[PDB]
Amino acid sequence: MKPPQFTWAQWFETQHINMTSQQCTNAMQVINNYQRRCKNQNTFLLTTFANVVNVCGNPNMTCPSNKTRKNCHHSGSQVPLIHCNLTTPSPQNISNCRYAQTPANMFYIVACDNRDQRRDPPQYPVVPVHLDRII
């Protein structure tokens, strides 16, 4: 779930592209403070928003995480990424959650959609809206 002030693409960016700190515990505070809960697992791709938008231009493929969807796209090239895993769940005081960080080089599959007409910038008619998988 995402806060109301973000479009799916802006949330995708906040969750999977803008790692505000190379450390998972700090980077996750942003997502957690927005979601009002400590996300158990989250991947940050060490790539640019424009790069992912271009991956959206790759051939459509079935989303492995939602088999009924055909709006996914495979990166075709591996990218460095950091996977954050919750090590200290704290349902009562989320600013207290701690995470581990796991660096890797893998492909990514992103679900893409037409932009939010009213709130997304016209610059990108097609945008990533979900990180379906890293393989």
Ligand SMILES: Nc1ncnc2c1ncn2[C@@H]1O[C@H](COP(=O)(O)O)[C@@H](O)[C@H]1OP(=O)(O)O
């Ligand atoms: N409405 C949706 N349609 C397709 N994939 C979704 C949707 N909501 C979440 N996902 C993706 O399904 C997986 C599980 O989502 P969740 O943990 O929120 O239930 C994640 O890859 C997530 O990507 P993302 O985290 O980029 O939204």
